[model samples]
Target: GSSGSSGASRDLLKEFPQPKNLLNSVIGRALGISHAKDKLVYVHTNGPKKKKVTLHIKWPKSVEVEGYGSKKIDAERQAAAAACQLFKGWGLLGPRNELFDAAKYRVLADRFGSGPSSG
Candidate 1:
């Protein structure tokens, strides 16, 4: 029982790979610029010690997602990251390219097919 406690504790703090270009990834898919509106709002942090930037996004039919962080670009990046994940959850798989590059479709297929879900 003691051994199980220690081993489990180590695994509890799971780490996820952080992408540097989360915003680019989402934008590359034409999330807001092509299909929706992108907006940013500065969230009052109550003091200057901390700053917050809230990113708001809209879907083609008006679905929304709020992702925020400490700075403007990072806020957008966080927003993009969340949007990308949610889009995957919404089955927004990339379009199939009959004659174009299969990398995008193939990668997303593998990335989300087994990685994302709806509860």
Candidate 2:
């Protein structure tokens, strides 16, 4: 599934914002509007006997992203990571409210064990 986040067996991003929250900072920089506007995001979830949860996150009126889940919240974050990744490639993106950090977490990389995996 999609949703993601957390910390600890070792170092992650330096001063990294949590996933769902980071997405908030990046919500619409992809749209290329430079202005301040207070807004809200709409997140949708379904009751799951489907064994995994899928969440839909939407805002910016016409933009939307789909994500899968483990614990409902875990599902929430993977979506954020996935969303921004898409948005990044989808647009050139202009300077925004403040400078933001770029990536180190890759998709399959985000879900897998780090260097030195052994079994």
Candidate 3:
């Protein structure tokens, strides 16, 4: 039956907002990086202060997922990578990798127990 649920229902490409401070990386910015084969993806947080800033991509749409034309596929992957680069984990699924590596993570530590620090 035709439910007429608006294009979003069958759009295949849709975005969902996630809470911030879960993993600490501000993953809300990744709302549009899904693939054609993706059915559902997760948003993960990785920083201190209980931030939720990570993404768990899954079930790509499986139709080339072209929003960026012929280069869409590569571009999406690159975009995801770019988002990952901002975090200190190096986007690894291993424990050895630091959640917020000390080298570039002091910023987090400095602001951990205090109010936001000034630049």
Candidate 4:
């Protein structure tokens, strides 16, 4: 009974990490540039006082992915397909490998594989 009383008196504020400071960014903005259109694919704090944040993204012209489309498949579908291919560590090489280099492909693969979390 005595132990329970002490536990209740203890402050709960010190037990967890501060949400405001934890979510704050020193640079004021997240990394990366807009991929396409007005879409921005980066994560950052809304503002110093504001606790909200966002991670923007813009898929390419031709690709498709599961659950990210409507009833029909069109340009969005194509774009998600291309994105899926890259995420699976596939290459974008041509017959003569004239378009992109190996290093770029590797980077793209990494980015697409775990680009962003759905939640």
Candidate 5:
């Protein structure tokens, strides 16, 4: 089950261009590029489900990063990490999202002793 947001949280870097040299970094393995032209990313999901869900993240075509040496690479990693987190929040579950407990609401009245509001 998923909470449908008419317009849920939108990522600002939906079009950020990804560097071609991302795989050269140490953490590059953490990210899987889905679409290079569109800067799409592949985010993996964790759970007992047999079918694994892969989330595609669309990043901004450009970004602002000012620093000396290797800053650009670091920035790329940061962007990928951010995108991963965003997609995970979208519905990756486990780490990014929490599992929904349908029974939790059912027992709320009994657990907290539901009563008329003190008006």
Candidate 6:
């Protein structure tokens, strides 16, 4: 499921006033027009129950690269890649708004351990 914030942000950009070219780069990118990175993603349970589970999208900072275009593109690709990961996990379309209970989930993680595993 997509988050309300992500959907709203996307809608805002879709209807906002701006030139197509400029808007696509700024608001569109933010709204994840093509990738929808800011949104949370999920996946289906691998079982007979066919239960759908929230996919924890692991967003990375950047990939190593040279040249300005490559660097920028790498950043975008990283985001898009993260989105794809979420898509694969959730097996559905839309932003991640309320898949997991934020309060409980975080508290559990904190109790379990720290480092990357906690996340």
TM-score of each: 0.37, 0.40, 0.21, 0.19, 0.27, 0.22
Candidate 2, residue 45: the lDDT equals 60
Best by TM-score: 2
Q: Hey, what RMSD does candidate 1 come out at?
A: 10.6
Residues 1-119, model 5: lDDT tens digits? 58655432554234323322431121122222333434344333344333232324322212222111234444444445444433334332235234324343224223433334331
RMSD of each predicted structure: 10.6, 14.1, 17.9, 19.4, 18.3, 15.7
- Per-residue error at 56 for model 3, in Å? 17
Between prediction 3 and prediction 5, the one with superior TM-score is: 5
Model 4 lDDT at residue 46: 33
- lDDT for residue 37 in candidate 2, whole number 0-100: 25
Candidate number with greatest lDDT:
2
- Model 2, runs deviating above 4 Å: 1-17, 28-42, 50-61, 92-119
- Global lDDT of model 5: 0.33
Error of 4 at 42 (Å): 14
The digit string of per-residue lDDT tens for model 4 on 1-119 reads 35432122432223312312211111111222222323322233333443322323333222322212222332233223323323223344333222354456445445545455431
The model with the greater lDDT, 5 or 6, is 5
TM-score, candidate number 1: 0.37
Better of 3 and 4 by lDDT: 4
Poorest lDDT segment (10 consecutive residues) of candidate 4: 19-28
> Can you rank all candidates by TM-score, best first?
2, 1, 5, 6, 3, 4
Error of 5 at 110 (Å): 38
**lDDT (10s digit) by residue, model 3, range 19-41:** 11222232222222222124223
Where model 1 places Cα greater than 4 Å from the true spot, the runs are 1-49, 94-119
* TM-score result, candidate 4: 0.19
